[PDB]
């Protein structure tokens, strides 16, 4: 359902075609103003004609989009407009929808902008952890499960597609002390402090510790864990390395900027 963008682009293209025709026929109403060496108006004429051709081509290309207009006559919208004439004395519902959309977008933008708040300083619950863990596990290809073997510590474990599972410990909040290990583990009947790797997942554990020390927000730990999980999800490909080659070293990954590249290059 991305037809709204195509429709907006088509509207803009038609408006551009109209404006280009208007500009062409307004400039053609004026000869060479002042050349004194050679009539350079032919260049502007050719540019305007090429712009008209560009707009026509853009309209023809947008014609390829907009596959079909589905049925479902406004998707349960007609209840009093197309329904009983008593019911529609109706615009209140549409006004409420538009106002809610505008309020949501405006509040989102305002929050994203005021994220850099001028807060000087801060001066003058083992039930929601399972819920937050389940809400985070609701994401695809991120099957996790917490064990809590010793005390209130949430010694959970994650695994995305590979056998590179990560035993990320927690403290009922602001989870820290993570250790990544690939291709087998859980010795005995619990987690471990092995951290064994092939000199590659050691860098991954270092980056994960840096991230855990990086996302330390003053409040809202649920958003912190969600950001941590969507940051960790970027390790599902490992098939990119800008600013260098793919194999500059043995390993290649550091995406704090949502673009993983070769290490020792940041």
């Amino acid at each position: 359902g991305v037809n709204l963008e195509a429709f907006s682009q088509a509207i803009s293209a038609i408006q551009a075609l109209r404006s280009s025709v208007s500009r062409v026929f307004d400039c053609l109403k004026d000869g060479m103003r002042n050349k004194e060496t050679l009539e350079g108006r032919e260049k502007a004429f050719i540019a305007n004609f090429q712009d008209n051709l560009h707009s026509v081509n853009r309209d023809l290309n947008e014609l390829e989009r907009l596959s079909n207009l589905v049925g479902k006559p406004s998707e349960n919208h007609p209840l009093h407009n197309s329904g009983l004439l008593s019911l529609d004395p109706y615009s209140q519902l549409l006004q409420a929808y538009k106002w809610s959309n505008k309020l949501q977008y405006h509040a989102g933008l305002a929050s994203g902008l005021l994220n850099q708040q001028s807060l000087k300083r801060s001066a003058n619950p083992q039930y929601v952890d399972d819920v937050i863990s389940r809400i985070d596990r609701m994401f695809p290809e991120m099957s996790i499960h917490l064990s809590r073997p010793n005390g209130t510590s949430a010694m959970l474990l994650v695994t995305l597609g590979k056998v590179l599972k990560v035993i990320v410990v927690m403290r009922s909040l602001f989870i820290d002390r993570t250790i990544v290990k690939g291709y087998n583990t859980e010795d005995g009947k619990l987690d471990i402090w092995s951290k064994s790797s092939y000199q590659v997942f050691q860098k991954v554990t270092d980056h994960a510790t840096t991230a855990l020390l990086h996302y330390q927000l003053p409040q809202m730990p649920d958003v912190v864990v969600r950001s941590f999980m969507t940051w960790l999800r970027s390790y599902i490909k490992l098939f990119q390395a800008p600013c260098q080659r793919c194999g500059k070293f043995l390993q290649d990954g550091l995406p704090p900027t949502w673009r993983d590249f070769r290490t020792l290059e940041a």
Binding site: K29, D30, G31, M32, R33, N34
Partner: protein, 237 residues
């Protein structure tokens, strides 16, 4: 006097003025009434019909449209011309231009299209306005309703060459050697000036060469002194 006509009883150019005693509508009858033969002087009629004769073709329409708008915040609006003699000369010009357009297809435009004979209707209106203007009579009925109807043809925005004034009323003025102090249709006006543009004393602003072939009569008439604006002046682009 542009007439390089054939022999005639007495001054064939005067018949266009003697045509005053004629019918009102259907100039096609009036021309056959007066004369139709000795009114072709040059086969190259494409000298002033399209460029120069458009002036009268638009001025007749602008005068007709200005009649039903006497309520405008101006005594004549733009112009009134309720003397009659000027209207008679206008009708004579309409007759001769009808003869021209009959001789050659380069007549005055319908000003857009779709007059079913725009010249016929324009002439009917001219004569209806001219009949009660001739000799000491009242003026306008059906004419006021006919002028109210506008075909899919009527343009506007005519040049109407005017002259700026010098209103140094009664006290003082302080000008400079430069930096002016704020207080004609024969082509002669593209969108942006790109020719000689030899201005005049009041309004003319006509080009110097005019890029023509056989209308040099106007040029020779205007190179010398002018309508109190003989002081022709050159102004750059």
């Amino acid at each position: 006097p542009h007439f390089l006509n054939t022999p005639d009883k007495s001054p064939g150019d005067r018949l266009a003025e003697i045509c005053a005693k004629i019918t009102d509508v259907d100039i096609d009858k009036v021309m056959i009434n007066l004369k139709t033969e000795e009114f072709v002087l040059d086969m190259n009629t494409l000298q002033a019909l399209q460029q120069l004769l458009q002036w009268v073709g638009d001025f007749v329409l602008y005068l007709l449209v200005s009649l039903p708008n006497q309520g405008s915040p101006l005594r004549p609006g733009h112009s009134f011309l309720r003397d009659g003699t000027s209207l008679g000369m206008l009708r004579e010009l309409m007759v001769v231009i009808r003869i021209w357009g009959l001789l050659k297809p380069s007549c005055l435009p319908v000003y857009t299209a779709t007059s079913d004979d725009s010249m016929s209707l324009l002439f009917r209106l001219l004569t209806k306005l001219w009949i009660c203007c001739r000799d000491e009579g009242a003026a306008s009925p059906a004419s006021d309703g006919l002028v109210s109807r506008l075909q899919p043809k009527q343009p506007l925005r005519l040049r109407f060459g005017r002259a700026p004034t010098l209103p140094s009323s009664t006290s003082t003025l302080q000008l400079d050697g430069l930096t002016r102090a704020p207080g004609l249709h024969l082509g002669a006006y593209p969108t942006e000036e790109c020719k000689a543009c030899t201005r005049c004393g009041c309004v003319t602003m006509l080009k110097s060469p005019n890029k023509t072939t056989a209308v040099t009569q106007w040029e020779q008439r205007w190179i010398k002194n002018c309508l109190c604006g003989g002081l022709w002046r050159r102004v750059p682009l």
